């Protein structure tokens, strides 16, 4: 299992970690050298489980499908808390299964849902590390709308990180004093299945995507994606979703 402690939490230990949550994640063959992740995987081996220490030492434990990197839930003492998804459903017949009590979150796991119930969407949700031991701090002690901007920031401060080397430097910068994402990190997060799909099928198209992908680079410029010699190819996408789950 993977831990990250905040209390001396540094560039380079944030690093370390986010390395070795990608190193947890099994994968048989790598698309363009970049790891693929599994279409499935059955039993409790199909998560992986993150202990968070904050700033004061406590902590949470994150249970992630190793197939999609996807939060399903975490458990923060004796309570157990699952977003209100089928797959969370499943996964929480695996972990946690020792928590006095288990609740449901009064919403799924996708952007999209948690933007709504935190009341803004992340482009306005400061992240970095502060911001992190911040969400750890809030998960401890239930409340359904601060946790909701609290795993905007958990799930961008871990698994958007993991899967972008980019994301994983924003954050970096990020170690001592938040700040909004950038819309390119956004344009990422949200083309990470596009971008998975367009590698696999370059593997058998001479390296070129069927379906170019637009993103937003760093100088804040809508660019397109037509190729695996793209640096986001070569140097940041980190993991690729498996395309049989798109
Ligand atoms: C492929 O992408 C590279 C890098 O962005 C670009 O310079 C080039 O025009 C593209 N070439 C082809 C054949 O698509
Ligand atoms: O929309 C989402 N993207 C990535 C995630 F990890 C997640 O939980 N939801």
Same mark, same amino acid.
């Given at each position: #299992?993977?831990?990250?402690?905040? !209390? /001396?939490?540094?560039?380079?230990?944030?690093?370390? +970690? =986010?390395?070795?949550?990608?190193?947890?994640?099994?994968?048989?063959?790598?698309?363009?050298?970049?790891?693929?992740?599994?279409?499935?995987? !059955?039993?409790?081996?199909?998560?992986?489980?993150?202990?968070? +220490?904050?700033?004061?030492?406590?902590? =949470?434990?994150? %249970?992630?499908?190793?197939?999609?990197?996807?939060?399903?839930?975490?458990?923060?003492?004796?309570?157990?808390? +699952?977003?209100?998804?089928?797959?969370? #459903?499943?996964?929480?017949?695996?972990?946690?299964?020792?928590?006095?009590?288990?609740?449901?979150?009064?919403?799924?796991?996708?952007?999209?849902?948690?933007?709504?119930?935190? &009341?803004?969407?992340?482009?306005?949700?400061?992240? /970095?590390?502060?911001?992190? #031991?911040? %969400? =750890?701090?809030?998960?401890?002690?239930?409340? !359904?709308?601060?946790?909701?901007?609290?795993?905007?920031?958990?799930?961008?401060?871990?698994?958007?990180?993991?899967?972008?080397?980019?994301?994983?430097?924003?954050?970096?910068?990020?170690?001592?004093?938040?700040?909004?994402?950038?819309?390119?990190?956004?344009?990422?997060?949200?083309?990470?299945? &596009?971008?998975?799909?367009? =590698?696999?099928?370059?593997? /058998?198209?001479? /390296?070129? +995507?069927?379906?170019?992908?637009?993103?937003? #680079?760093?100088?804040?410029?809508?660019?397109?994606?037509?190729?695996?010699?793209?640096?986001?190819?070569?140097?940041?996408?980190?993991?690729?979703?498996?395309?049989?789950?798109?």
């Amino acid at each position: #299992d993977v831990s990250f402690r905040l !209390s /001396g939490a540094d560039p380079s230990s944030y690093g370390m +970690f =986010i390395k070795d949550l990608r190193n947890a994640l099994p994968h048989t063959e790598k698309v363009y050298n970049i790891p693929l992740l599994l279409p499935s995987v !059955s039993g409790a081996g199909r998560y992986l489980l993150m202990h968070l +220490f904050n700033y004061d030492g406590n902590t =949470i434990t994150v %249970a992630v499908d190793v197939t999609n990197v996807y939060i399903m839930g975490y458990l923060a003492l004796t309570t157990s808390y +699952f977003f209100n998804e089928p797959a969370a #459903d499943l996964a929480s017949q695996y972990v946690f299964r020792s928590a006095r009590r288990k609740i449901t979150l009064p919403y799924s796991g996708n952007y999209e849902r948690l933007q709504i119930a935190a &009341g803004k969407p992340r482009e306005k949700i400061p992240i /970095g590390l502060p911001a992190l #031991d911040t %969400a =750890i701090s809030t998960l401890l002690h239930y409340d !359904s709308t601060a946790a909701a901007g609290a795993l905007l920031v958990l799930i961008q401060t871990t698994a958007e990180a993991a899967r972008f080397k980019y994301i994983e430097q924003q954050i970096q910068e990020r170690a001592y004093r938040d700040e909004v994402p950038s819309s390119a990190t956004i344009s990422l997060e949200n083309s990470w299945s &596009g971008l998975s799909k367009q =590698i696999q099928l370059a593997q /058998g198209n001479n /390296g070129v +995507f069927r379906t170019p992908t637009v993103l937003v #680079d760093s100088k804040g410029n809508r660019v397109q994606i037509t190729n695996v010699t793209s640096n986001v190819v070569t140097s940041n996408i980190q993991l690729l979703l498996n395309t049989k789950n798109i």
